[PDB]
């Protein structure tokens, strides 16, 4: 599923993330955006360490979620990859919520810090009534 940005926004507001360990929503819309276009079945292989990229977060199967395929891999948020693929995000929003859980935070993501990090992301939840 593809989502439209305030549909997403709204979205994301009542599944609670918005402030989440320090994290506002217009940062979680801008990493949803970067990281998939907000597309819950994106998937990418990273030829160079054979690991996947999972969903709308694009959550890395060799920490957060098992696959089965990706060498010395752990299932941090203890779900089947596949589960970050639904339409439905509620499961990969509580994986996402785990991994900022972590001391970097939404650093996790580099295309958070090349593309969101500093910058005015008010954009992304303008008009959508959050």
């Given at each position: 599923?593809?989502?439209?940005?305030?549909?997403?926004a709204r979205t994301l507001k009542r599944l609670g993330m918005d402030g989440y360990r320090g994290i506002s929503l217009?940062?979680w819309?801008?990493?949803?955006?970067?990281?998939?276009?907000?597309?819950?079945?994106?998937?990418?292989?990273?030829?160079?360490?054979?690991?996947?990229?999972?969903?709308?977060?694009?959550?890395?199967?060799?920490?957060?979620?098992?696959?089965?395929?990706?060498?010395?891999?752990?299932?941090?948020?203890?779900?089947?990859?596949?589960?970050?693929?639904?339409?439905?995000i509620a499961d990969a929003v509580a994986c996402a919520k785990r991994?900022v859980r972590?001391?970097?935070?939404?650093?996790?993501?580099?295309?958070?810090?090349?593309?969101?990090?500093?910058?005015?992301?008010?954009?992304?939840?303008?008009?959508?009534?959050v």
């Amino acid at each position: 599923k593809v989502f439209e940005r305030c549909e997403l926004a709204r979205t994301l507001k009542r599944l609670g993330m918005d402030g989440y360990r320090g994290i506002s929503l217009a940062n979680w819309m801008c990493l949803a955006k970067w990281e998939s276009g907000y597309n819950t079945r994106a998937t990418n292989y990273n030829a160079g360490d054979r690991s996947t990229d999972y969903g709308i977060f694009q959550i890395n199967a060799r920490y957060w979620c098992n696959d089965g395929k990706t060498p010395g891999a752990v299932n941090a948020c203890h779900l089947s990859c596949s589960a970050l693929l639904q339409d439905n995000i509620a499961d990969a929003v509580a994986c996402a919520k785990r991994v900022v859980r972590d001391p970097q935070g939404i650093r996790a993501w580099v295309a958070w810090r090349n593309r969101c990090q500093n910058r005015d992301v008010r954009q992304y939840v303008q008009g959508c009534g959050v």
